[PDB]
Amino acid sequence: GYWGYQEFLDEFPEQRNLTNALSEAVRAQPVPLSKPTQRPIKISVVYPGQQVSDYWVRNIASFEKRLYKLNINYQLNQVFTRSLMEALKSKSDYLIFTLDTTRHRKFVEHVLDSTNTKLILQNITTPVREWDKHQPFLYVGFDHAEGSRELATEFGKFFPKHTYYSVLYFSEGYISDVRGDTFIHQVNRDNNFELQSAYYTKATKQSGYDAAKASLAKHPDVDFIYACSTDVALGAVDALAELGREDIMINGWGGGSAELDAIQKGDLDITVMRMNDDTGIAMAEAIKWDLEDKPVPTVYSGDFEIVTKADSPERIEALKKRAFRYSDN
Amino acid sequence: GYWGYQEFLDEFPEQRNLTNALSEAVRAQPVPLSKPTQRPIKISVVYPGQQVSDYWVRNIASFEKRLYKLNINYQLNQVFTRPNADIKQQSLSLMEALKSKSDYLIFTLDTTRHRKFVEHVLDSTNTKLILQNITTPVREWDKHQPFLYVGFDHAEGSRELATEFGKFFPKHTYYSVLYFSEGYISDVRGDTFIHQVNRDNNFELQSAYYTKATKQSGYDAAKASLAKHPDVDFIYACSTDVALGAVDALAELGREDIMINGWGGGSAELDAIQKGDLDITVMRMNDDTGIAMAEAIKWDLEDKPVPTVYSGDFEIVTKADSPERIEALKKRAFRYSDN
Amino acid sequence: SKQQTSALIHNIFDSHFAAIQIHHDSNSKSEVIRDFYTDRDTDVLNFFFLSIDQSDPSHTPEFRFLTDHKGIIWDDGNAHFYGVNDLILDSLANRVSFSNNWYYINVMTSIGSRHMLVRRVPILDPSTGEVLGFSFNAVVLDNNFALMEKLKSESNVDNVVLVANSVPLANSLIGDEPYNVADVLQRLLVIETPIVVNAVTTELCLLTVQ
Amino acid sequence: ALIHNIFDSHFAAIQIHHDSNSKSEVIRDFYTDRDTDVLNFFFLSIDQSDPSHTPEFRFLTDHKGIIWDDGNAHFYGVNDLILDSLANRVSFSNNWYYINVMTSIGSRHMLVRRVPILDPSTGEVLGFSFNAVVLDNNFALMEKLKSESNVDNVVLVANSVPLANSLIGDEPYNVADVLQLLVIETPIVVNAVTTELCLLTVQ
Ligand SMILES: C[C@]12OC[C@H](O)[C@@]1(O)O[B-](O)(O)O2
Ligand SMILES: C[C@]12OC[C@H](O)[C@@]1(O)O[B-](O)(O)O2
């Protein structure tokens, strides 16, 4: 099972204390490392890669830059995935990974139960309930459910009750549940929206394209499509162009550069934009506190802004300023 | 797992004695209830009795008669469904029987569906359970067994048919099998026959079909089977309706060269026997399982022990039996239900 | 040890549902179930479930049903036995809003309250990734003979009582022992093991007797 | 702590896979076209996908006899004649049978079960699918039983006679010491019937 982000913080007042302290450090200027180390610390990162979404790439750039600014001595070695075994051997001080599939679970459990490596889980902010004895060093991301609720609140404004929509999920797993089913449930509960169809995808632009075609060929009568990730959203944008259905509103999920360009063209109508660099900065601040023998919160979530195609190019530019403060340089 | 009927009685010698005692009371003339009750007993019957087979119709007719002749004061709610149909009605009737706290619920066990219902009634504080048309106690339920399993042992009757086909036909004879729907009946009637015929006579099974336990379903499976495997000397049918459906199929295709059995020997099967349309059947001494139930209820009311299981007996009947032989069997079989 | 019996008991409970869930996951990939969304041939569907429950009695749910994205399109007819009418079935469908997780549900019926574990699974079209709808499985805990017998038999304790808060819902008592269920409830080595569903502790407890 | 639950769970897992696979269009199709490559790959998929829960051998029959087996049976002493008698011994479907048979390379202790292969439209029984677990020298199962029950070692015994164990060979004891150090006895129940089989755990 999973705790909800706020649920976890409410359940553990000490964890809210700690998450608030981290949010503040992330906000304020870099206060460099108190305890210098004997060696350079070793960090392995295993990320998705080959994505139109720049989340992972920008996250590393934001992470390294904050590490440099805090005066941490690190050896960072990275892998982007088209072997977790090949990562295990390198005996690192901090492993940065993700958790979406049951395949990731299997590994994380093994890493938690049979190693010493401090584990950071990126793109999940909902602690596993069964691990309350031995939680990962840090869950860090932009809370999927919060972002979906924000998109849901907006759609709930643009369309009257009983409006028709379809859903393009991620691949099967955690992301689909917390982005897709969260949105479905709220919009159904609150707005009496009616779901016509839903499709799992292969988490690529190609499959995003294919799924939208398949969806619209079978259920042409929707007012919007909700997409659960960046690449899937942009695939669906093409399919909508091709079929000439820009009467159909569609969202992005994350608000990276490629999404922002598409927003500005009116290819995407709305997105939930994450203050991207904060989670790269959080992981550096978390590593620093660890090196200073300070307690580190189990969970960190960054903030979002809602972005629409109606927004000024100045609004967009001011958001790119906050969100990519590090990874844009 | 199930205990075989004899296997269960051999395992618990006390149960053999209880069953033996019950058979005597069923054979003997009615000795009325010796402890009258402060109110009528509430009896609920939920049976798949809407069939061409009169087994369930006659089981209740004879049961009621014996309850009458036993001076037992009762109320009987009776619901009949089609096999594999009226599913909602069946669940509702069972629910209503338990809600109204019937003293006895009379039901059956063929499928996992029936089993699940029965498992939920086992620890009941108010309702005793009689499972008709099964005589093989469930092993898992030892020490929490229903009040009574009552019927005509499917295996014994299949063994008797298998012995007879073993004699009619030469080794390596080709046959097909029309099962009931999936479940206990198909397993104990069908697989018992197949097994014995294969090891004792090397008969060679050419095809087998599960059916929907209906005439139409028997017709359809028979036609499909013979289309693919026309070269069989007999068809073993696992039930009455299925058999009579197959009868229509062989006629439609001009094929009474193929021998077909019934299974049970009620009125419609007997008419088809004497007409030449069925070649053989295993005939149940029908009314004994209705009577056994009434006698089992009487014993419970007089605070006596009641056997966990009761099986009646069969006679073999062929189309070569005299109108004399059948008539005399009908007077044994339908002693209450015909009267 | 009181904690070793408690861990044993929860492992048995957990592995009973883990097997029912494996079974449900697996059967839910059937082409028959998939095709039902197009064909709506109820004979074919019923024959199929008849066939898998015959194959596996101890892992069959008490009741099951199919939905699309608007509502229940088919039920197996078993739920009625447990007091679960159409209305209450819908409420179950609506309470289970996430896939691949057991939900503990306590509902009132005309015959009393019902205590259930219910889960859903998406039915996909593997050539398009389309979610055609959902398959639900419900386990009724009330008078659940087979589960009480598993807990007893595989833990080697003498008896079990399942309680909601502390109304008894099921037990393994033969009726020949020194104690009844009421005696067990009155808190000779009786151990309370709380029932955890989806890593959240429910109102249910298993009481073991030695 | 009990290996009883883990043991039973293991065979329940095997059974669930077998029931599900036997409903596959792949197996139904093999009855008509006999493409042994398609079939062998189908079972390769499932096997490497779940190496922990797979029978030591499989075979298929039609009503006349065995039409295919996976090649594994003979390595256990289960020759064509013995395979044939196995098929006939397992005369009811959907149930585990505990079978012990003499082979030319020693006694063999097995659990066998069959499931009918059906046309889901016509109701035809095409034949049966069998799965067998050889218990003798089943190291992987012994290893699973050992680690999942947090005990030091496990020995499987058929009527006081060892037939499999998890011993590494370096511990301050042998299998003989186990049969006469805390050893516990857990008998195996098959299809509601207690068998001669017993699991001996050590801590
Ligand atoms: C970070 C991310 O989560 C899923 C996918 O990996 C992603 O990169 O795509 B996205 O920008 O919607 O969000
Ligand atoms: C009693 C019975 O068992 C199955 C079916 O219900 C039946 O009526 O058909 B039959 O007469 O062969 O026997």
Tab-separated table of N, CA, C and O in Angstrom, chain C residues 139-198:
chain	number	residue	atom	x	y	z
C	139	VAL	N	-14.652	-11.804	-1.846
C	139	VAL	CA	-14.627	-12.872	-0.862
C	139	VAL	C	-15.469	-12.427	0.316
C	139	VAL	O	-15.193	-11.382	0.902
C	140	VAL	N	-16.500	-13.211	0.640
C	140	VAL	CA	-17.344	-13.006	1.815
C	140	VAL	C	-16.696	-13.738	2.997
C	140	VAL	O	-16.493	-14.970	2.967
C	141	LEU	N	-16.338	-12.990	4.033
C	141	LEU	CA	-15.625	-13.559	5.194
C	141	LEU	C	-16.542	-14.267	6.204
C	141	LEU	O	-16.104	-15.139	6.960
C	142	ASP	N	-17.798	-13.840	6.220
C	142	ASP	CA	-18.846	-14.343	7.092
C	142	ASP	C	-19.060	-15.826	6.828
C	142	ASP	O	-19.348	-16.213	5.689
C	143	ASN	N	-18.909	-16.631	7.888
C	143	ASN	CA	-19.119	-18.079	7.847
C	143	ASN	C	-18.301	-18.691	6.710
C	143	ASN	O	-18.764	-19.523	5.939
C	144	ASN	N	-17.059	-18.242	6.609
C	144	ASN	CA	-16.236	-18.679	5.516
C	144	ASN	C	-15.507	-19.893	6.011
C	144	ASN	O	-14.364	-19.817	6.475
C	145	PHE	N	-16.204	-21.016	5.913
C	145	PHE	CA	-15.677	-22.317	6.326
C	145	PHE	C	-14.238	-22.596	5.885
C	145	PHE	O	-13.363	-22.886	6.726
C	146	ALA	N	-13.997	-22.489	4.578
C	146	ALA	CA	-12.701	-22.861	3.992
C	146	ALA	C	-11.554	-22.031	4.533
C	146	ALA	O	-10.443	-22.542	4.722
C	147	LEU	N	-11.798	-20.741	4.760
C	147	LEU	CA	-10.751	-19.901	5.320
C	147	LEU	C	-10.545	-20.215	6.806
C	147	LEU	O	-9.411	-20.263	7.265
C	148	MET	N	-11.627	-20.453	7.552
C	148	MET	CA	-11.461	-20.837	8.968
C	148	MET	C	-10.696	-22.165	9.079
C	148	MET	O	-9.791	-22.298	9.910
C	149	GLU	N	-11.008	-23.109	8.188
C	149	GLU	CA	-10.287	-24.389	8.138
C	149	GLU	C	-8.836	-24.291	7.729
C	149	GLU	O	-8.013	-25.032	8.254
C	150	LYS	N	-8.506	-23.378	6.828
C	150	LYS	CA	-7.110	-23.115	6.491
C	150	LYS	C	-6.347	-22.521	7.673
C	150	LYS	O	-5.259	-22.970	8.028
C	151	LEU	N	-6.904	-21.474	8.268
C	151	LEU	CA	-6.242	-20.858	9.396
C	151	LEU	C	-6.003	-21.887	10.497
C	151	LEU	O	-4.889	-21.990	10.974
C	152	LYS	N	-7.017	-22.673	10.862
C	152	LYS	CA	-6.861	-23.711	11.885
C	152	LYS	C	-5.802	-24.749	11.478
C	152	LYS	O	-4.743	-24.861	12.117
C	153	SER	N	-6.082	-25.475	10.395
C	153	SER	CA	-5.229	-26.553	9.935
C	153	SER	C	-3.757	-26.223	9.684
C	153	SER	O	-2.896	-27.035	10.005
C	154	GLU	N	-3.459	-25.077	9.086
C	154	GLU	CA	-2.067	-24.769	8.731
C	154	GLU	C	-1.283	-24.055	9.840
C	154	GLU	O	-0.077	-23.848	9.724
C	155	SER	N	-1.963	-23.687	10.921
C	155	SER	CA	-1.289	-23.051	12.044
C	155	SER	C	-1.163	-24.009	13.224
C	155	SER	O	-0.465	-23.707	14.199
C	156	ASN	N	-1.866	-25.139	13.151
C	156	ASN	CA	-1.887	-26.102	14.242
C	156	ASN	C	-2.374	-25.568	15.605
C	156	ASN	O	-2.021	-26.120	16.655
C	157	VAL	N	-3.160	-24.488	15.583
C	157	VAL	CA	-3.917	-24.045	16.761
C	157	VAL	C	-5.181	-24.882	16.788
C	157	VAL	O	-5.508	-25.537	15.796
C	158	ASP	N	-5.886	-24.856	17.918
C	158	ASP	CA	-7.053	-25.723	18.132
C	158	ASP	C	-8.338	-25.201	17.542
C	158	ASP	O	-9.175	-25.997	17.130
C	159	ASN	N	-8.516	-23.877	17.543
C	159	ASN	CA	-9.698	-23.217	16.934
C	159	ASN	C	-9.454	-21.737	16.573
C	159	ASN	O	-8.506	-21.115	17.078
C	160	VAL	N	-10.281	-21.206	15.670
C	160	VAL	CA	-10.255	-19.777	15.280
C	160	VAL	C	-11.642	-19.149	15.277
C	160	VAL	O	-12.626	-19.794	14.908
C	161	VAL	N	-11.703	-17.903	15.730
C	161	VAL	CA	-12.870	-17.051	15.583
C	161	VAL	C	-12.435	-15.735	14.902
C	161	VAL	O	-11.482	-15.064	15.355
C	162	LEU	N	-13.114	-15.396	13.807
C	162	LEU	CA	-12.980	-14.089	13.163
C	162	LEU	C	-14.037	-13.125	13.714
C	162	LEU	O	-15.238	-13.451	13.775
C	163	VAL	N	-13.576	-11.956	14.149
C	163	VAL	CA	-14.455	-10.937	14.728
C	163	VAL	C	-14.255	-9.578	14.071
C	163	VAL	O	-13.165	-9.257	13.607
C	164	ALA	N	-15.344	-8.820	13.983
C	164	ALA	CA	-15.328	-7.440	13.512
C	164	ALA	C	-15.482	-6.650	14.766
C	164	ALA	O	-16.469	-6.803	15.483
C	165	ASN	N	-14.488	-5.823	15.062
C	165	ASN	CA	-14.383	-5.248	16.399
C	165	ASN	C	-14.495	-6.424	17.397
C	165	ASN	O	-13.466	-7.023	17.750
C	166	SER	N	-15.710	-6.792	17.807
C	166	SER	CA	-15.912	-8.084	18.516
C	166	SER	C	-17.340	-8.633	18.456
C	166	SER	O	-17.922	-9.131	19.436
C	167	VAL	N	-17.883	-8.530	17.255
C	167	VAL	CA	-18.989	-9.345	16.838
C	167	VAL	C	-18.310	-10.506	16.118
C	167	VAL	O	-17.464	-10.261	15.248
C	168	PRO	N	-18.626	-11.766	16.518
C	168	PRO	CA	-18.171	-12.950	15.771
C	168	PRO	C	-18.800	-13.063	14.382
C	168	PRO	O	-20.023	-12.901	14.249
C	169	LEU	N	-17.957	-13.341	13.373
C	169	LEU	CA	-18.394	-13.471	11.966
C	169	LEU	C	-18.161	-14.865	11.388
C	169	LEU	O	-18.841	-15.270	10.445
C	170	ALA	N	-17.160	-15.564	11.912
C	170	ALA	CA	-16.880	-16.937	11.509
C	170	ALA	C	-16.044	-17.621	12.565
C	170	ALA	O	-15.290	-16.959	13.297
C	171	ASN	N	-16.140	-18.949	12.611
C	171	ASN	CA	-15.337	-19.762	13.536
C	171	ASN	C	-15.173	-21.225	13.058
C	171	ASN	O	-15.916	-21.692	12.186
C	172	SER	N	-14.213	-21.933	13.648
C	172	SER	CA	-13.913	-23.320	13.294
C	172	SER	C	-14.349	-24.321	14.376
C	172	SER	O	-13.916	-25.480	14.361
C	173	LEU	N	-15.198	-23.878	15.306
C	173	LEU	CA	-15.606	-24.706	16.435
C	173	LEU	C	-16.408	-25.910	15.975
C	173	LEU	O	-17.390	-25.783	15.244
C	174	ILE	N	-15.985	-27.088	16.408
C	174	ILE	CA	-16.759	-28.306	16.141
C	174	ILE	C	-18.051	-28.321	16.987
C	174	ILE	O	-19.143	-28.525	16.448
C	175	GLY	N	-17.925	-28.036	18.283
C	175	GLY	CA	-19.057	-28.094	19.211
C	175	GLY	C	-18.878	-29.076	20.370
C	175	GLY	O	-19.739	-29.187	21.246
C	176	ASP	N	-17.756	-29.779	20.373
C	176	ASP	CA	-17.414	-30.740	21.424
C	176	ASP	C	-16.316	-30.212	22.389
C	176	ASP	O	-15.749	-30.978	23.171
C	177	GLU	N	-15.974	-28.926	22.315
C	177	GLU	CA	-14.840	-28.451	23.116
C	177	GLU	C	-15.302	-27.876	24.462
C	177	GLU	O	-16.505	-27.661	24.653
C	178	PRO	N	-14.361	-27.705	25.422
C	178	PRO	CA	-14.640	-27.094	26.749
C	178	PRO	C	-15.251	-25.686	26.702
C	178	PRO	O	-15.795	-25.219	27.703
C	179	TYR	N	-15.154	-25.009	25.559
C	179	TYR	CA	-15.539	-23.599	25.457
C	179	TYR	C	-16.447	-23.432	24.240
C	179	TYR	O	-16.370	-24.237	23.315
C	180	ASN	N	-17.326	-22.429	24.261
C	180	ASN	CA	-17.986	-21.914	23.041
C	180	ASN	C	-17.356	-20.591	22.558
C	180	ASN	O	-16.406	-20.079	23.175
C	181	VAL	N	-17.893	-20.039	21.469
C	181	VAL	CA	-17.379	-18.773	20.902
C	181	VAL	C	-17.513	-17.619	21.901
C	181	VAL	O	-16.594	-16.839	22.064
C	182	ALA	N	-18.658	-17.529	22.572
C	182	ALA	CA	-18.834	-16.533	23.631
C	182	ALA	C	-17.730	-16.620	24.691
C	182	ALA	O	-17.212	-15.598	25.127
C	183	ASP	N	-17.347	-17.826	25.096
C	183	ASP	CA	-16.251	-17.943	26.063
C	183	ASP	C	-14.938	-17.395	25.517
C	183	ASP	O	-14.155	-16.778	26.262
C	184	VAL	N	-14.693	-17.640	24.229
C	184	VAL	CA	-13.472	-17.176	23.571
C	184	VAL	C	-13.444	-15.646	23.575
C	184	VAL	O	-12.435	-15.040	23.941
C	185	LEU	N	-14.572	-15.041	23.204
C	185	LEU	CA	-14.757	-13.585	23.218
C	185	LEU	C	-14.530	-12.909	24.585
C	185	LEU	O	-14.233	-11.713	24.644
C	186	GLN	N	-14.673	-13.667	25.668
C	186	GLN	CA	-14.536	-13.114	27.010
C	186	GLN	C	-13.096	-12.965	27.483
C	186	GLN	O	-12.591	-13.777	28.262
C	187	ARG	N	-12.449	-11.909	26.987
C	187	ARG	CA	-11.114	-11.497	27.436
C	187	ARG	C	-11.181	-10.244	28.311
C	187	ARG	O	-12.268	-9.724	28.586
C	188	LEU	N	-7.380	-21.949	26.479
C	188	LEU	CA	-7.062	-21.002	27.547
C	188	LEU	C	-5.939	-20.001	27.171
C	188	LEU	O	-5.897	-18.899	27.719
C	189	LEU	N	-5.050	-20.368	26.245
C	189	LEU	CA	-4.238	-19.362	25.545
C	189	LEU	C	-4.993	-18.838	24.299
C	189	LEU	O	-4.924	-19.446	23.227
C	190	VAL	N	-5.734	-17.737	24.475
C	190	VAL	CA	-6.383	-16.999	23.381
C	190	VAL	C	-5.471	-15.867	22.897
C	190	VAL	O	-4.999	-15.060	23.692
C	191	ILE	N	-5.211	-15.820	21.593
C	191	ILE	CA	-4.342	-14.794	21.000
C	191	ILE	C	-5.106	-13.965	19.949
C	191	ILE	O	-5.711	-14.547	19.052
C	192	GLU	N	-5.106	-12.631	20.102
C	192	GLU	CA	-5.652	-11.687	19.100
C	192	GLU	C	-4.652	-11.337	18.004
C	192	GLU	O	-3.585	-10.791	18.297
C	193	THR	N	-5.002	-11.634	16.751
C	193	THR	CA	-4.208	-11.216	15.576
C	193	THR	C	-5.036	-10.271	14.683
C	193	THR	O	-6.027	-10.689	14.069
C	194	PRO	N	-4.622	-8.987	14.599
C	194	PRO	CA	-5.399	-8.003	13.858
C	194	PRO	C	-5.276	-8.255	12.367
C	194	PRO	O	-4.202	-8.594	11.893
C	195	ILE	N	-6.372	-8.118	11.636
C	195	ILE	CA	-6.337	-8.325	10.193
C	195	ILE	C	-5.983	-7.040	9.413
C	195	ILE	O	-6.677	-6.031	9.501
C	196	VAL	N	-4.898	-7.131	8.650
C	196	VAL	CA	-4.364	-6.063	7.824
C	196	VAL	C	-4.683	-6.348	6.352
C	196	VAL	O	-4.335	-7.399	5.822
C	197	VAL	N	-5.356	-5.403	5.699
C	197	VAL	CA	-5.691	-5.498	4.277
C	197	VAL	C	-5.056	-4.307	3.551
C	197	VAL	O	-5.273	-3.151	3.937
C	198	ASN	N	-4.261	-4.597	2.513
C	198	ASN	CA	-3.552	-3.577	1.728
C	198	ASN	C	-2.671	-2.706	2.644
C	198	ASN	O	-2.624	-1.469	2.493
